[PDB]
Design a protein around this ligand. Structure first.
Ligand SMILES: CCCCCCCCCCCCO[C@@H]1O[C@H](CO)[C@@H](O[C@H]2O[C@H](CO)[C@@H](O)[C@H](O)[C@H]2O)[C@H](O)[C@H]1O
Lengths: 54, 31
C-alpha cells in the first residue's frame, strides 16, 4: 500500500472523536434519540423487574 | 436525566430507607 501527503486536506485535521462529534449531534442526531431511549428503557425495565418497591 | 430521577424517585440503589397510640378511651360515667 502506498501513501503521500496532502496540504489542502491537512489545514485543520480533527481527531476521530472530533470528527464523530461534528456529525453525531447534528446530521445523524436521530440515532442519538433512539439510543437515548434504548438506554432509558434498559434503566426503567431492569429496575422494575428486580427490586421490591419501597 | 429523566431516567436518573426515576431511580432517585424509587431508591433503586436502595440506599435510603435506613409513636402516637390509636387506642383512645372515653369516660361516660355510671350506668
Ligand atoms: C438537573 C438535575 C436534576 C437532578 C435531580 C432533580 C431531582 C429529581 C429527583 C428527586 C425527585 C423526587 O423523587 C423522590 O425521591 C425520594 C428519595 O429517594 C423518594 O423518597 C421516598 O421513597 C423512598 C423509597 O421508598 C424512601 O427510601 C424515602 O425514605 C422516601 O422519602 C420519593 O419516593 C421520590 O418521590
Amino acid at each position: 500500500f502506498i501513501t503521500s501527503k496532502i496540504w489542502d486536506g491537512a489545514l485543520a485535521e480533527n481527531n476521530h472523536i472530533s470528527s464523530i462529534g461534528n456529525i453525531m449531534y447534528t446530521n445523524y442526531n436521530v440515532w442519538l434519540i433512539l439510543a437515548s431511549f434504548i438506554l432509558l428503557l434498559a434503566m426503567v425495565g431492569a429496575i422494575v423487574i428486580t427490586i421490591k418497591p419501597r | 436525566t429523566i431516567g436518573f430521577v426515576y431511580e432517585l424517585g424509587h431508591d433503586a440503589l436502595k440506599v435510603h430507607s435506613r409513636l402516637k397510640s390509636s387506642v383512645v378511651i372515653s369516660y361516660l360515667g355510671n350506668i
